[PDB]
């Protein structure tokens, strides 16, 4: 039972470290990819209009 | 990828057209100008011939 609380605390630490250091960069990369593809689509529309 | 290639080709084609429109413009501008100049030249030649034959018949 005690080991259960211990590994819950460990998982809380894991979640904190994740959300605080791994989440920001991966989210930024995801936003960069989304912006790049959106810009590509916008360029396609602009080129067709041109 | 096909969309990216199509966008590049469309930009290239728009650049080509903004030049080809003016190219054909100037081409038939020059065609009309040359035709008009030829019409004027033949009119002048006809007038010269007419006055020359008038000279000849009047002298006779």
Residues of chain A contacting residue B1, judged by C-beta atoms under 8 Å apart = none
Enter the DSSP assignment of B29: H
10 Å Cβ neighbour count for B7? 20
**Residue A48's closest chain B neighbor by CA?**
B10
A39: contact with B, CB 8 A cutoff: no
Q: Kindly state the tokens that stand for B11.
A: 């930009």
Nearest C-alpha of chain B: how many angstroms from A37?
Answer: 10
Three-state SS annotation for chain A: CHHHHHHHHHHHHHHHHHHHHHHHHHHHHHHHHHHHHHHHHHHHHHHHHC
Q: How far is A41 from chain B (nearest CA, A)?
A: 8
Calculate the alpha carbon distances from B14 to A9, B19, B34, B40 in Å: 62, 9, 30, 39
Closest CA to A43 of B24, B18, B21, B3: B3
Contacts of A50 (CB under 8 A, 6+ apart): B10, B11, B14
CB B7 within 8 A of CB A47: yes
> Of the candidates A6, A27, A43, A11, which has an alpha carbon nearest to the alpha carbon of residue B7?
A43
Alpha-carbon distance of B60 to B57, in angstroms, equals 5
Could you give the maximum distance between any two Cα atoms of chain B, in Å? 87
Q: Which residues of A touch B6 (CB under 8 A)?
A: 44, 47
Resolution value, angstrom units: 2.7
Q: Is A7 on the interface with B (CB under 8 A)?
A: no
The answer to whether B7 contacts A43, with C-beta atoms less than 8 Å apart, is yes
């Amino acid at each position: 039972m005690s080991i259960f609380i211990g590994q819950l605390i460990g998982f809380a630490v894991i979640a904190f470290i994740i959300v605080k250091w791994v989440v920001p960069p991966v989210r930024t990369l995801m936003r960069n990819q989304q912006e790049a593809v959106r810009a590509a689509l916008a360029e396609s529309a602009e080129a067709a209009k041109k | 990828e096909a969309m990216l290639a199509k966008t590049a080709a469309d930009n290239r084609k728009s650049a080509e057209q903004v030049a080809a429109a003016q190219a054909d413009y100037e081409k038939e501008m020059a065609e009309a100008r040359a035709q008009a100049s030829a019409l004027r030249d033949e009119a002048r030649a006809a007038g010269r011939s007419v006055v020359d034959e008038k000279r000849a018949q009047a002298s006779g």
